Amino acid sequence: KLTRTRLDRLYGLPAADPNNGKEYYEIAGRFSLISLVPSNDDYQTPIA
Amino acid sequence: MASLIYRQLLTNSYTVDLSDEIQEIGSTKSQNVTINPGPFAQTGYAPVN
C-alpha cells in the first residue's frame, strides 16, 4: 500500500517497516553433528 | 649307523615326490588373502567442490 503513486501493490517485503506489530517469527529445527576433538584413550585397549 | 640312515634317505623318494605333488597342488588350491585395516578409522573432507 502506497498512495498517490503510479506504481502500487508491488510484491515483496516493505522497505520501511518490518516491525509487523505481532510478536515475532518462529524458526526452529533440529541438528545432527560432525566434528573431531580430543577424546578418551583407545590406546589403553589396543586388542579386541 | 648309516645303514638305516642312507637306507631311509633313499627309500622315501616316494615321500619326497609325494610332497612335491602335495605342495604343488596345494599352491594351486591356495585361497584368497585379506587384511583388516585395524582398529583405526580413515576419513576426511569428502565433498570437495
Q: Bin the helical content of chain A.
A: under 10%
Distance between the termini of chain A: 73 Å
* Content-based structural category of chain A: little secondary structure
Characterize the largest beta sheet of chain A: strand count, sense, and whether it forms a barrel. Answer: none
Number of extended strands of chain A: 0
Assembly category: part of a larger assembly
- What is the radius of gyration of chain A? 27 Å
Indicate the proportion of strand residues of chain A: under 5%
Shape of chain A: rod-shaped
- Give the helix tally of chain A: 0
Motif (YGL motif) (chain A): 11-13
Organism (chain A): Rotavirus A
Subcellular location (chain A): Virion
Protein name (chain A): Outer capsid protein VP5*
Structural summary, described in words:
- This is part of a larger assembly, with two copies of chain A.
- Helices cover 0% and strands 0% of the residues of chain A.
- The first copy, chain A, has 48 residues and is largely without helices or strands.
- Chain A is rod-shaped and about 80 Å long.
- The chains hardly touch.
- The PDB classes it as virus.
